[PDB]
């Protein structure tokens, strides 16, 4: 059902994007990891680092594409479908450029508004998998995207990021749990300060 158990985090591979605005979904997934004791391994097979554990008393499987974000769908579409994992029980976790560094919000369906991981993935399995969208703020002008999101962010939007990304690791029980408008609800209130 709309038992969240997967959930996927979007990024570049390589220590020089680890810090970049396009790993958002990274940091996010990576600090979940780390919160519930799930193991991050290497998965060749997938074209990521995946892992598989226990939230709140639910089996859950993460994941990180490895094949550079434009890629992304070469890594989830696969995976998800060999776990038989239907899309309603997705999340995936990405940066959003429509929105501000410490605006958070959960989302069901809709297109992929640019994001070039999305892009990758919607084609394939459809759009109704919820996303964690993660604010990280426009550079203005349209060409300037690039230079955005593979740039890293001044310190107070980092620390704008990093409460917003705390909040909804707080969020996820709901989520595993199937409280999907709940957690849309108390994810989309969050306020920085
Ligand atoms: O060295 C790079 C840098 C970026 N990109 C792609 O350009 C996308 C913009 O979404 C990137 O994030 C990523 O897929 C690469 O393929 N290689």
Known sequence: MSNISLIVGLGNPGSEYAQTRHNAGFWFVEQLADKYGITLKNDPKFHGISGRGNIEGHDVRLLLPMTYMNRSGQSVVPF????????????????????????????????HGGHNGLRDIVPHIGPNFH??????????????????????????????MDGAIDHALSKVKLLVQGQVPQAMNQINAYKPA
């Open 80 to 111: 998800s479908k060999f776990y038989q994992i239907a899309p309603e029980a997705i999340l995936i976790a990405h940066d959003e450029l429509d929105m501000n560094p410490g605006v958070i919000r959960l989302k069901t369906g809709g297109g």
């Open 131 to 160: 996303r964690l969208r993660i604010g990280i703020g426009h550079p203005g002008s349209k060409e300037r995207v690039s230079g955005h999101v593979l740039g890293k962010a001044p310190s107070n939007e980092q620390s704008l």
